[PDB]
Structure 1
Amino acid sequence: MWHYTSINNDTRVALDPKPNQIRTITKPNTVPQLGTDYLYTFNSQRRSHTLRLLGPFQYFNFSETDRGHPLFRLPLKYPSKAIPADELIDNLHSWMRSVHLLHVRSEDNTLRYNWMLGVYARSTNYTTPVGQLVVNAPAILNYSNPQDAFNSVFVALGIDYIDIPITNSNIFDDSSTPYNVRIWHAPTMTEVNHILALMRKSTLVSTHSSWHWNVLHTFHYRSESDMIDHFAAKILEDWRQKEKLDKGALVEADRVIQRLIPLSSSTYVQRLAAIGALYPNEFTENVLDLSRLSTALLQLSDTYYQHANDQLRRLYRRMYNDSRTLYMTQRHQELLLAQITADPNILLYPYTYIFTTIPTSMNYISNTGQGRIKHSLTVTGATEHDTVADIVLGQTGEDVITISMVEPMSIAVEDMYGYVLDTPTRDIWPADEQIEQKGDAVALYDTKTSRALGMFNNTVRIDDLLSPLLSLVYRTYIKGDTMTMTQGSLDHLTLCAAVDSDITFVGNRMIAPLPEGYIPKPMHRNNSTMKMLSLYVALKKLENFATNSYLMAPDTSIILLGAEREPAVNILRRFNRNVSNVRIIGMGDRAVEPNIRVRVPFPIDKNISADFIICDINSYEDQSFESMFSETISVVTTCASAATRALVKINHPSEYMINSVIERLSQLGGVFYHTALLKTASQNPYSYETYIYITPIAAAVRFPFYSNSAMINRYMTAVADDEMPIIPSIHTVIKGHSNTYSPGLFCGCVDVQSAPLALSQLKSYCSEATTWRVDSDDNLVNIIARIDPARIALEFRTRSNTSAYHEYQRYVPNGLGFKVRKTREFRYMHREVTFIHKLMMYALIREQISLTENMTQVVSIGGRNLADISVVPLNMKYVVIDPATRIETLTQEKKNIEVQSRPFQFDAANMDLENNSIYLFIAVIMNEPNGAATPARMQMDKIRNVATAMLTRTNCVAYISFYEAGIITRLDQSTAHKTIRVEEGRLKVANYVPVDTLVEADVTLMLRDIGITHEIIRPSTPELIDACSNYGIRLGSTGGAVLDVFNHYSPVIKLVR
């Protein structure tokens, strides 16, 4: 595909009409039509009108008389807005009626009409000698052979040339033209050579490689700058054309070498001529910016003038020293030959060198146009590094990058109202257990809960987490954009929570349109509002699970026992406006009206009862544990006595408090209270506060007491930390392979030349790093990169510092981002709950592994993409046995990581466990290598085989993660599980296939039957806080609801030998 395929033709000659078409060329009869006769456009940003005639009129000199027409008065008439199409058309038409070119129509079919000379004559109003010649002999405009059309006016006038002014394409601007086109009487090649030679003796002139009408023409520039802009535009045209020719596509180029040839110019135009003729690779890669084309072009020459390549340098120099020569590739030259063959007397520029182009292998990446690049840095690369210099990152203005504290949680509205349950497990409550749990709860109360947990709970508020969403429902409703929703629907409740005004349906599934001029204020909500709504939804889902309508039944009542302004009471009262007869009242000790102000327990005289209650009592006052205990007890007691469906808060849900509550309900005469712990998704994600759910049932409740419950573990495992909480730093110095960085994120900017080096270094820490320039003009590239503990745990296993620097340098300068808009990074990015549970399990196993002495290696079977790498210490060797893992022999050899890349066999005899080894089986047992679910008996079987296989071993430690059965009991009763599911009795976490769950009792019983040491451990609250603090993660609401019940039912068996 080397040879060019092209059909060169004098397009400008084809544009000239037959003499007979000249009479109607204005189309006097009909209005000009947009996109055919004219092309109007108004750029509002520039406030610049631009009209552009099509057809022959694209080349049209205007007489001052023509410029006196109102059409040209139009842009001044409408300084700030588009000319209405009616005025544009009517003025353009009346002006078209105004024009009449001189012509002598004739019957010869070979004849054409010299449009240029006719419109020119008309524009000068026939005062120039050409205009005289035309006004007296219009027939001279008609021509057969295109060249003779001018020869005829050259002989008849006796002049050697004619200076025709150029046309601006946009008929609106009246600005002085940059240059003009002289036309020479040179019929022969010889006459042309002489004119060219003489032209090289005079200032500021240039010409094309070939000419239209086969008549020589020269551009004469009014200044150097005009010559530069002209040469530049032509270089762009020639480069685009050649870019197309080299693709082997057929082209209808009007001329083979589109770019101009200086005959006499300054230095700078000679530079443009040189890089122009070079056809540099840099154009094709879009490495240059066309926003200020000539500038970049000049700069390009500057590189080539001193180019690292010898061939390209000497070639550019040689082209610079012979600017008058027209350098061209051999493939162009054959096209010039075909042209000279088809038209033997064609003129084309005679001084011409034919160079072989110099190949270059550097494929630069590039992309002008908005969009930051989100790099995923490789751990290693072909490039080696040795003692890399520290790379300072600049301060960034807030005009470019803002750093908000916590990422707001995008979510569906229904997801806000979900909740999870935790049913009681123990059938009895032994007194020694009571003393132990009481000592635990007292010790835990007297010394405050973890400071880091407090920091997260007080930083990641649910109110701000929901705010962008709740406001959005308000903003849509204010615009009237919202329309259809069911009466009892959760979307409806969200709407009542978003606006203060009462809503009303005009019919089924249709809210009433806003009255004109009415813009009701958004509903005012405190932090506990959405939570109280979600608790109400929870009670509605507990009275019967299948319900879709959430409206209270007629002739029923609810109480929100903890109260202040309690906006939720107002929202709920307005949500149920269409239901007849329903009490809805708050009742705090601080309660303001509508809510009654009253203490709990209720005064002995006052009568309080309801079908539902939602307590949220919480004493702000610091107090003795005994008083807190007696108060919470009395609150649960009065809450249970007053209603058939209490939903009491428990501020300090120790096993002792909850069990004392169960015992107290046991003590009440004649009623048996079924109960369940609960946690809505509208709670603050980190709060250990839990809502007990009291109901009466006729049956005595088997297993009523709690022991090792999830919601309880969320609180009890949290304890005062030894250390201060890990505040997220913003790093600004990228040290080379240092491993000193506290969790946080790199953020700043560098000169774009230094950018490939920066990405080369931060690969050591951050897994991935967004970058962008602010504009094509500003050389600094901004860079943001959150620090990944996993990447540190991988990269720092050895001292080698390889990277893909050689690839990252293919980005400079256009290949690493553009974004004018300010970007907003968060110190605590969102992550799905399963990911958080993964990181938690990793913190648990890693802390567990660091304690062990004298272990040669970590064997993580089913390790996927080195997911378990964070767990293993940098010193000991790491091993993976996941078939799905990709092989990187260089990365493996450089970073001390074997990869078996085969399906691990669970049969005991085939299995070979090394002594002094840590065997991770993190979520691998529950699936086959191909991803199909393995039935639970096979899972208990393979766990039994891993157990028996390590019986011979002296020092070995298995970590078999699995799914406990109890969760399916709890998720069947819960609502807040957007990720986790229960398809036909099997867990369906994330996108994974549904998978049957083991029962913990039979597993532990089997391990006792094997006699191997074992300890069923699960990650706790401090592990969660370590995960979030290290990875920079905020939990999120659905995650806060589901994480306790999910984490507790992913036990990690710890086999030990």
Structure 2
Amino acid sequence: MWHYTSINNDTRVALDPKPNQIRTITKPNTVPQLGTDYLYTFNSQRRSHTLRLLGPFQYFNFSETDRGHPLFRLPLKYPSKAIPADELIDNLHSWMRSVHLLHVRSEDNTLRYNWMLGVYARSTNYTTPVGQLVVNAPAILNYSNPQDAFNSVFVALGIDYIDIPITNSNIFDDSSTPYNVRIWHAPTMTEVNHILALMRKSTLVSTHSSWHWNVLHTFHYRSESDMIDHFAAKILEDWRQKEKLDKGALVEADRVIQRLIPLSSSTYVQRLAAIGALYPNEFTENVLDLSRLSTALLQLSDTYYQHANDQLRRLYRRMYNDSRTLYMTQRHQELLLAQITADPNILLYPYTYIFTTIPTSMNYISNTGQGRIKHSLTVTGATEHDTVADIVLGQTGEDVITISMVEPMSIAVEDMYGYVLDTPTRDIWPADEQIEQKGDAVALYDTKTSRALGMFNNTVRIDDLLSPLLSLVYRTYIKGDTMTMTQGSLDHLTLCAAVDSDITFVGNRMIAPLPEGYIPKPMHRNNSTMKMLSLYVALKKLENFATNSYLMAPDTSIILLGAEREPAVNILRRFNRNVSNVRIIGMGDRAVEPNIRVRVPFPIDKNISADFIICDINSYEDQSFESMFSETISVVTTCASAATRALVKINHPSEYMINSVIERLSQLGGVFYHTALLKTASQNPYSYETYIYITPIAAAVRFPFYSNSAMINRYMTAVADDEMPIIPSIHTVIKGHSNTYSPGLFCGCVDVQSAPLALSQLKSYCSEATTWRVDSDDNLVNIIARIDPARIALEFRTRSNTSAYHEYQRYVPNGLGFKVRKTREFRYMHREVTFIHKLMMYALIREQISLTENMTQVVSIGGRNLADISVVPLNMKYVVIDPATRIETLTQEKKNIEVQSRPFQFDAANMDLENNSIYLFIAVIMNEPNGAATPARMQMDKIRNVATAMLTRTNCVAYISFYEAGIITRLDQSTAHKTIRVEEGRLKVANYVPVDTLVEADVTLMLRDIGITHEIIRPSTPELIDACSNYGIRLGSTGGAVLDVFNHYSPVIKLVR
């Protein structure tokens, strides 16, 4: 595909009309049409009108009489908005009538019409000698041979040349033209040689490699800069055309070398001609910015003037020393030869050199236009770093990067009202267990719960977390864009919670349009509003699970026992407006109207009852444990006595508290109480506060007391912390291979030459790094890159500091981002619940692993893409046994990581457990290597095999993660599981196929039968805070609702020898 394939042709000659068409080239009878006769456009940003005539008229000089026409007055008439199409068409049409080119029509089919001379003579009003010649002998404008079209006028005038003014392409700007073209009387090539050689004796002139009408024409610029912009536009043209010829596609090119040849010019133009001739790889790569094209070309000529490549430098220099010569690739020259063959007497520039183009292997990345580049740094690469200097990141303005404390959660509106349940397990509550649990509860309450837990629970409030969604619903309702929704739908509730006004449907699934001029204020919500709403939805879901409508039944009532403003009472009253007879009242000791203000326990005189009760009582006063206990007990007592379906809050849900509550419901005469712990998606993500759900049932409740329940453990595992909470740093210095960075993120800016370097260095900590230049003219690249602990635990295993720096230097300068918009990174990004559970697993197992002495290696079977690497200490060897793992022998050798890349064999005879080894089986036991779920009996079997296989080894420790059966019982009754499911009774985490779960009792019994030492541990609250802190992650809402029940029901078996 070397040879250029192009049909060269004189397009400018083709544009010249047959003489007969000149009478009607204006098309006087019919109006000009957009896109055919003209191309009007209005750049509202620049506020600049631009009319561009099409066809023969694109080349048109205007007599000053033509400018006096109203059509040219229009852009001044409309400074601000686009000229209306009616006025444009009407005025342009009348001016089109106004024009009439001189001609003599004739029968000969070979004839053309010298349109250039015709319009020019017209525009001068025939006062130039060319104008007289035309006005007296219009037939002279007709021509057969294109060149003799002018030779006739030259011989007729006795002049050696004419100097035509150039058209401005937009007809609205009247600004003085940069240059004019001078047509010469040079019929033979020799006359042209002479005119060129004389042309090198005089300033500011240049000419095309070949000329239209086959008549020599020279541009003469009024200033140096005008020449520079001209040359640059032509270099763009020839570069694009050569870019198409190089791809080998056929092109209708007007001439083989589209760019200009200086004949006399300043140094800067000679530079432009030289790099223009070079056809530098940098244009194909889009390395230059075209916004200020000529400048880019000057800098490029600079780099070439002292290029590292001797060939390119000597070639550029040679092109600069002899700028009058037209350098061209051999493939161009063969095209020129074909052209000389087709038209033997054609004129084309005689002074020309045929250089061989110099190949360059460096493929620069580029992408101009908006969009930050979201890098994924490699851990290692071909480049070998040695003692790299610290790379300071510059300060960056808020004009470019803001750092919001928390990421607002994107979520479907229904998901907010989800909740999870946790039913009691224990059949009895022995008194020794009471003394123990009370000891743990008093000791826990007396010294306040973890400071980091509080920092998170208060940094990530649910109200600001759900804010954009609610304000979005209000913003759509205000524009009238919202329309259809069910009367009882959760979307209806969100709508009632978004706006202060009463909503009323005009019919089924159709809300009333807003009255004109009425824009009701958004409904006021405190932090506990959405939560109370979700507890209401939970009550409706608990009375029956089948329901889709959430409206209360007629002649029924609800109470929201905790009350101040209690906005939820208002949103509920507004949600049920079409339902007859629905009492809804708050009733706090701090209650404002509508809500009645009254203390709990209720006064003996007052009569209170309801079919539903949503207590939210929480004394602000600091108090002794006995008083908090008796108060919570009396609260649940009156809540149960006053309603068939209480939904009481518990601020301090210790096992002792909840069990004492159950003992109290047991003590009440004649009414057995079914009960369940609960937590909504609308609760604050980190609150350990729990909603116990009371309801009478005719049967006595088997297994009524709690023990090691999820919702409780979310609280009790949290305790006073040994260390201060980890505040997210914003690093600006990127040390080479330091391992001294606290959790948080690098953020800042660097000069773009230094950009590839910094990416090569932040790769050590950051796993992925967004970057962007802010503008084409702004050299700095902004960089944001949060620190991944997994990347640290990987990269710092050995002292080698390799990276893909050679790849990153391909990026500069256009290849690493562009975005004018301010970007808003968060100190606490959103994550799916499964990922956070995985990080809690890794924190638990890592803290468990640091405690062990004298362990030679960590073997994570099913380790995928080194995902468990965060657990293993930098010393001990790491080993992966996942078939899915990709092989990287360089990374393996450089980072001390053996990788089996074969399926693990769970059969005991095939087992090969080394002494002093830590075998990780984190969620790998539940799946076959191809991904299909293994049946639960097979899972318990392979656990039994890993258990018996370890029985011989003197020192070993397995960590077999698995799912407990109880979770399926809980997710059958819960709602807040957007990710986790229960397809046909099996768990379905993420995108994995559903998998049957082991029962904990049979597994522990089996391990007792094996005789192996074992311990069924799960990650705690402090591990969660550790994960969220170290990773820079915030939990989110639905994740915070389901995390307790999910993480409590993913135990890690801890086999030990």
> What TM-score do the two structures reach when normalised by structure 1?
1.00
Q: Could you tell me how far 1:1027 is from its partner in structure 2?
A: 0.1
How far apart in 1 are the matches of 2:1032 and 2:196? Answer: 71
Query: What CA deviation, in whole Å up to 9, does each residue of 1:395-432 have, x standing for no partner?
Result: 00000000000000000000000000000000000000
Q: Could you tell me how far 1:836 is from its partner in structure 2?
A: 0.2
Displaced runs of 4+ in structure 1, greater than 2 A? none
Q: Could you tell me how far 1:678 is from its partner in structure 2?
A: 0.2
Q: What is the aligned partner in structure 2 of residue 324 from structure 1?
A: 324
Secondary structure of the structure 1 residue equivalent to 2:219: strand
Query: What CA deviation, in whole Å up to 9, does each residue of 1:897-956 have, x standing for no partner?
Result: 000000000000111100000000000000000000100000000000000000000000
How far apart in 1 are the matches of 2:650 and 2:324? Answer: 91
How far apart in 1 are the matches of 2:899 and 2:783? Answer: 34
How far apart in 1 are the matches of 2:753 and 2:83? Answer: 46
Q: Could you tell me how far 1:156 is from its partner in structure 2?
A: 0.5
Query: What CA deviation, in whole Å up to 9, does each residue of 1:694-713 have, x standing for no partner?
Result: 00000000000000000000
Q: Could you tell me how far 1:38 is from its partner in structure 2?
A: 0.2
Q: Could you tell me how far 1:296 is from its partner in structure 2?
A: 0.4
Q: What is the aligned partner in structure 2 of residue 757 from structure 1?
A: 757
Q: Could you tell me how far 1:313 is from its partner in structure 2?
A: 0.2
Q: Could you tell me how far 1:884 is from its partner in structure 2?
A: 0.2
How far apart in 2 are the matches of 1:289 and 1:698? Answer: 80
Matches within 5 A, 1:42-61: 42-61=42-61
Secondary structure of the structure 1 residue equivalent to 2:485: coil
Secondary structure of the structure 2 residue equivalent to 1:355: coil
Q: Could you tell me how far 1:144 is from its partner in structure 2?
A: 0.2
Q: What is the aligned partner in structure 2 of residue 542 from structure 1?
A: 542
Q: Which runs of 5+ in 1 are unaligned?
A: none
Secondary structure of the structure 1 residue equivalent to 2:811: coil
Q: What is the aligned partner in structure 1 of residue 505 from structure 2?
A: 505
How far apart in 2 are the matches of 1:236 and 1:294? Answer: 10
How far apart in 2 are the matches of 1:584 and 1:299? Answer: 75
Secondary structure of the structure 1 residue equivalent to 2:673: strand
Q: What is the aligned partner in structure 2 of residue 89 from structure 1?
A: 89
Q: Could you tell me how far 1:339 is from its partner in structure 2?
A: 0.3
Q: Could you tell me how far 1:23 is from its partner in structure 2?
A: 0.1
Alignment of 1:17 onto 2:17: yes
Q: Could you tell me how far 1:115 is from its partner in structure 2?
A: 0.1
Q: Could you tell me how far 1:632 is from its partner in structure 2?
A: 0.2
Secondary structure of the structure 1 residue equivalent to 2:17: coil
Query: What CA deviation, in whole Å up to 9, does each residue of 1:448-468 have, x standing for no partner?
Result: 000000000000000000000
How far apart in 1 are the matches of 2:135 and 2:125? Answer: 9
CA RMSD for the aligned pairs?
0.3
Q: Could you tell me how far 1:994 is from its partner in structure 2?
A: 0.1
Q: Could you tell me how far 1:165 is from its partner in structure 2?
A: 0.3
Query: What CA deviation, in whole Å up to 9, does each residue of 1:689-735 have, x standing for no partner?
Result: 00000000000000000000000000000000011100000000000
How far apart in 1 are the matches of 2:640 and 2:368? Answer: 67
Secondary structure of the structure 1 residue equivalent to 2:934: coil
Q: Could you tell me how far 1:194 is from its partner in structure 2?
A: 0.2
Q: Could you tell me how far 1:252 is from its partner in structure 2?
A: 0.2
Secondary structure of the structure 1 residue equivalent to 2:300: helix
How far apart in 1 are the matches of 2:120 and 2:488? Answer: 78
Secondary structure of the structure 2 residue equivalent to 1:605: coil
Alignment of 1:747 onto 2:750: no
How far apart in 1 are the matches of 2:990 and 2:328? Answer: 61
Secondary structure of the structure 2 residue equivalent to 1:907: coil
Q: Could you tell me how far 1:579 is from its partner in structure 2?
A: 0.2
Q: Could you tell me how far 1:786 is from its partner in structure 2?
A: 0.4
How far apart in 2 are the matches of 1:200 and 1:882? Answer: 74
How far apart in 1 are the matches of 2:1032 and 2:784? Answer: 14
Q: Could you tell me how far 1:530 is from its partner in structure 2?
A: 0.2
Q: Could you tell me how far 1:1041 is from its partner in structure 2?
A: 0.4
Query: What CA deviation, in whole Å up to 9, does each residue of 1:863-919 have, x standing for no partner?
Result: 000000000000000000000000000000000000000000000011110000000
Q: Could you tell me how far 1:860 is from its partner in structure 2?
A: 0.2
Instruction: Work out the number of aligned pairs and report it.
Output: 1057
Secondary structure of the structure 1 residue equivalent to 2:714: helix
Q: What is the aligned partner in structure 1 of residue 688 from structure 2?
A: 688
Query: What CA deviation, in whole Å up to 9, does each residue of 1:801-851 have, x standing for no partner?
Result: 000000000000000000000000000000000000000000000000000
Q: Could you tell me how far 1:749 is from its partner in structure 2?
A: 0.3
Secondary structure of the structure 2 residue equivalent to 1:926: coil
Q: Could you tell me how far 1:389 is from its partner in structure 2?
A: 0.3
How far apart in 1 are the matches of 2:711 and 2:11? Answer: 81
Matches within 5 A, 1:499-538: 499-538=499-538
How far apart in 2 are the matches of 1:422 and 1:303? Answer: 70
Query: What CA deviation, in whole Å up to 9, does each residue of 1:635-682 have, x standing for no partner?
Result: 000000000000000000000000000000000000000000000000
Secondary structure of the structure 2 residue equivalent to 1:772: strand
Matches within 5 A, 1:629-640: 629-640=629-640
Secondary structure of the structure 2 residue equivalent to 1:749: strand
How far apart in 2 are the matches of 1:183 and 1:924? Answer: 82
Query: What CA deviation, in whole Å up to 9, does each residue of 1:313-338 have, x standing for no partner?
Result: 00000000000000000000000000
Alignment of 1:473 onto 2:473: yes
Matches within 5 A, 1:283-682: 283-682=283-682
How far apart in 2 are the matches of 1:134 and 1:951? Answer: 111
Q: What is the aligned partner in structure 1 of residue 730 from structure 2?
A: 730
Alignment of 1:902 onto 2:905: no
Query: What CA deviation, in whole Å up to 9, does each residue of 1:544-572 have, x standing for no partner?
Result: 00000000000000000010000000000
Q: Could you tell me how far 1:502 is from its partner in structure 2?
A: 0.1
How far apart in 2 are the matches of 1:428 and 1:277? Answer: 92
Q: Could you tell me how far 1:279 is from its partner in structure 2?
A: 0.3
How far apart in 2 are the matches of 1:699 and 1:687? Answer: 33
How far apart in 1 are the matches of 2:937 and 2:186? Answer: 98
Q: Could you tell me how far 1:535 is from its partner in structure 2?
A: 0.1
How far apart in 2 are the matches of 1:288 and 1:910? Answer: 61
Matches within 5 A, 1:207-218: 207-218=207-218
How far apart in 1 are the matches of 2:590 and 2:301? Answer: 78
Q: Could you tell me how far 1:765 is from its partner in structure 2?
A: 0.1
Secondary structure of the structure 1 residue equivalent to 2:319: helix
Query: What CA deviation, in whole Å up to 9, does each residue of 1:1001-1025 have, x standing for no partner?
Result: 0000000000000000000000000
Query: What CA deviation, in whole Å up to 9, does each residue of 1:151-178 have, x standing for no partner?
Result: 0000000000000000000000000000
Q: What is the aligned partner in structure 1 of residue 951 from structure 2?
A: 951
Q: Could you tell me how far 1:73 is from its partner in structure 2?
A: 0.3
How far apart in 1 are the matches of 2:298 and 2:1020? Answer: 64
Q: Could you tell me how far 1:631 is from its partner in structure 2?
A: 0.3
Q: Could you tell me how far 1:221 is from its partner in structure 2?
A: 0.3
Secondary structure of the structure 1 residue equivalent to 2:893: helix
Query: What CA deviation, in whole Å up to 9, does each residue of 1:44-67 have, x standing for no partner?
Result: 000000000000000000000000
Query: What CA deviation, in whole Å up to 9, does each residue of 1:754-775 have, x standing for no partner?
Result: 0000000000000000000000
How far apart in 1 are the matches of 2:396 and 2:983? Answer: 50
Q: Could you tell me how far 1:862 is from its partner in structure 2?
A: 0.2
How far apart in 1 are the matches of 2:131 and 2:81? Answer: 39
How far apart in 1 are the matches of 2:493 and 2:292? Answer: 56
Q: Could you tell me how far 1:272 is from its partner in structure 2?
A: 0.2
How far apart in 1 are the matches of 2:81 and 2:497? Answer: 43
Q: What is the aligned partner in structure 1 of residue 239 from structure 2?
A: 239
Secondary structure of the structure 1 residue equivalent to 2:347: coil
Q: What is the aligned partner in structure 1 of residue 102 from structure 2?
A: 102
Q: Could you tell me how far 1:1000 is from its partner in structure 2?
A: 0.2
How far apart in 2 are the matches of 1:118 and 1:388? Answer: 70
Q: Could you tell me how far 1:237 is from its partner in structure 2?
A: 0.1
How far apart in 2 are the matches of 1:944 and 1:336? Answer: 82
Query: What CA deviation, in whole Å up to 9, does each residue of 1:321-370 have, x standing for no partner?
Result: 00000000000000000000000000000000000000000000001100
Q: Could you tell me how far 1:987 is from its partner in structure 2?
A: 0.1
Q: Could you tell me how far 1:95 is from its partner in structure 2?
A: 0.1
How far apart in 1 are the matches of 2:124 and 2:642? Answer: 102
Secondary structure of the structure 2 residue equivalent to 1:53: coil
Query: What CA deviation, in whole Å up to 9, does each residue of 1:95-135 have, x standing for no partner?
Result: 00000100000000000000000000000000000000000
Q: What is the aligned partner in structure 2 of residue 718 from structure 1?
A: 718
Secondary structure of the structure 1 residue equivalent to 2:911: coil
Q: Could you tell me how far 1:270 is from its partner in structure 2?
A: 0.1
Matches within 5 A, 1:759-798: 759-798=759-798
